[PDB]
Symmetry: C3
Subunit: 133 residues, 3 copies
């Protein structure tokens, strides 16, 4: 068919960095464009085309069951192999990521309708607070 009308969400993106490298794009923008997904909207009236490609960030997914130690490759941060276990300690969700780094993990707990998350690695701690919508 010759009908390209519609809104198209990307499901695959192969050799994006090689194509961008052929265009002489800098390394910083290259490592950021490989972390994006694109949605192209196309209006076609016979031979007249209007196309706009919207770019968004790739959505990171993590599914797990409490008590089952699963293999995790942090494809979002440092790309390392860790073995992660999520445990219940009272009402605090505790997770340990055993690997090259020590004291690495995170801890979640809820207060009212705000979520508190502590990302730990070594002696460094990152604190993030979320509100519920």
């Amino acid at each position: 068919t010759r009908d390209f009308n519609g809104t198209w969400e990307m499901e695959s993106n192969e050799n994006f960095e090689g194509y961008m490298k052929a265009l002489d794009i800098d390394f910083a923008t290259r490592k950021i464009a490989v972390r994006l997904t694109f949605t192209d909207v196309i209006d076609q009236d016979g031979d007249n085309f209007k196309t706009k490609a919207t770019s968004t960030f790739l959505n990171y997914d993590e599914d797990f069951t409490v008590g089952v130690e699963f293999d995790e490759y942090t494809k979002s941060l440092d790309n390392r192999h860790v073995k992660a276990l999520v445990t219940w300690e009272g009402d605090v969700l505790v997770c340990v990521q055993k690997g090259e780094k020590e004291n690495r993990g995170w801890k979640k707990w809820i207060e009212g309708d705000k979520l508190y998350l502590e990302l730990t690695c070594g002696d460094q701690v990152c604190r993030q607070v979320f509100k519920k919508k």
Copy 2:
């Protein structure tokens, strides 16, 4: 007028990188801000102001008629001027972009309900598959 209330979308941004370099901003973050557009929301209560600037990536637009050679400035990627012509090759939309780069263009075609796009430049080719919403 002194009334600044409303939502304001950026249409032009001249010498942003020079201004940021004067602010001693690192090169990586500068190369990320040169690819953004801004939308500012303004609340004005007499002399009271509340401002929020939303940042997004500039979206690539391509409007054309098959067979008509149009001038295209390839923002979002390499910022180059090419002269592009779109042809029908069977049911495949073929486009050639004459410019500094050779073998540069793209090819779209539909199979089933998936859109396939092949971006080529030099000896590098990028393959993209899209699903309809």
Copy 3:
């Protein structure tokens, strides 16, 4: 409570770069990840978790009343402390940012239905024009 179901919007993110630096993450991806805000969707069925992390850009806010000299931290740009005051020059909103840099500030004014913004620092000036929606 042990119920984490829902959509959680980030409101605070402390020491994200230190945590990422402890993970040996490169400087480019760190300076873009020190931006951004995160929204995590969590579906919890007893002990089974399914999480999706949506990424967007950090907005950065600046709220002020005309005539009060306020402390401003340019988190959107260079992360410096300046003391900024916004003045009226006719119908033009003028603001000067006294700090480590000199001749630093901005000027906004409306003509027709377009907002004109001049970012100045050193001998470099950036001009931005916005249209109203």
